[PDB]
Amino acid sequence: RDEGRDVLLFVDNIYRYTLAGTEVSALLGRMPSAVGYQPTLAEEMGVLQERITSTKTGSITSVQAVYVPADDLTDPSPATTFAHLDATVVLSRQIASLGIYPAVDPLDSTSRQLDPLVVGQEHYDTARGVQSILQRYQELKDIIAILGMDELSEEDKLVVARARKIQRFLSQPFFVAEVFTGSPGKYVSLKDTIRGFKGIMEGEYDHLPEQAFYMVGSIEEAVEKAKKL
């Protein structure tokens, strides 16, 4: 960095680093913090995490896999790690248990730069639009389970239907993931990602069944898949 300007920094499990510091904290002879963690969790994280940054002399792009223990996003490691991230995408087991294998929870996952002035209005409105209807769906999820679909208004009925399309258009096969799954990979333009979701939300691709959207690239793939089935 302090010479050449543009570097990438990938780190597997910053947690494994904090976790290491915990196995030791006992023997280092300091009292235990909350949940048996070190009292120095706040700093041990910050020191390392504060090191990664864009200098005047050169910037650093960096993604890193922060593990969350026992699925608890309230567990200290994740809880404190959050503040140190520009963009924070989170994968939930519930979304995986379905079949969506970029298992990102599009609701609890956010970025500090999902800003209209930054990413243009079309991207923003589309992002928050997709976010909303997907959240409105989570609310209806309760009454559906107890009283069935036939109890929704014709409008809310359409809300869940459109949402469930989005919910599985979020999915797509990764190249690296071909090894253990027959599905060949795909790569979607940031341009297409907007075209499709904006599109589904407008109500264009309704007629198509849900499976048409599950595990495909651009929307024009969802279309062609609808033909086969």
Binding site: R93, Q94, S97, L98, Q138, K141, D142, I143, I144, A145, I146, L147
Partner: protein, 69 residues
């Protein structure tokens, strides 16, 4: 109606007549031109569907449990 060995009276349930009928017809047409509420008799369903609505509402239940849908 009298017939061989049988006579039936096919009674109207309310006074009929072209004047009274066109009155009911005009009413039915009007009520449709203006979506407007009207109470069905059932109270058993009323206060029960209300309690059901309040009890069901605002439960994070489907989120608390891990369910697919």
């Amino acid at each position: 109606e009298v017939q061989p060995g049988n006579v039936t009276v096919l009674a109207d349930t309310a006074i009929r007549g072209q004047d009274l009928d066109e009155a009911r017809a005009m009413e039915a047409k009007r009520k449709a031109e203006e979506h407007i509420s009207s109470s069905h008799g059932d109270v058993d369903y009323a206060q029960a569907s209300a309690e059901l609505a309040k009890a069901i509402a605002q439960l994070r239940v489907i989120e608390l449990t891990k369910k697919a849908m």
